[PDB]
Design a protein around this nucleic acid. Structure first.
Length: 55
DNA sequence: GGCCCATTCAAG
DNA sequence: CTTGAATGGGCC
């Protein structure tokens, strides 16, 4: 799978301002991006890991 | 259930 | 080789 440049945008923007998202927030964010909840939740998790790594 | 973590695996 | 989406197990 691969995400659009359009998607990585709102995703990264949201992530920068909010590192933990609720169920509803993830689900709506997924809806307006025509993505599944799973891949968005997964993305966020992976991003949290990425954020951790930088040391 | 979600999160954490190590690990996997399909393209650049 | 790196990248990052995706997996499974362990924990609350």
């Amino acid at each position: 799978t691969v995400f659009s440049s359009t998607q990585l945008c709102v995703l990264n923007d949201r992530f920068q301002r909010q590192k933990y998202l609720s169920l509803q927030q993830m689900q709506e964010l997924s809806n307006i991006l025509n993505l599944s909840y799973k891949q968005v939740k997964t993305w966020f998790q992976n991003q949290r890991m990425k954020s951790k790594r930088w040391q």
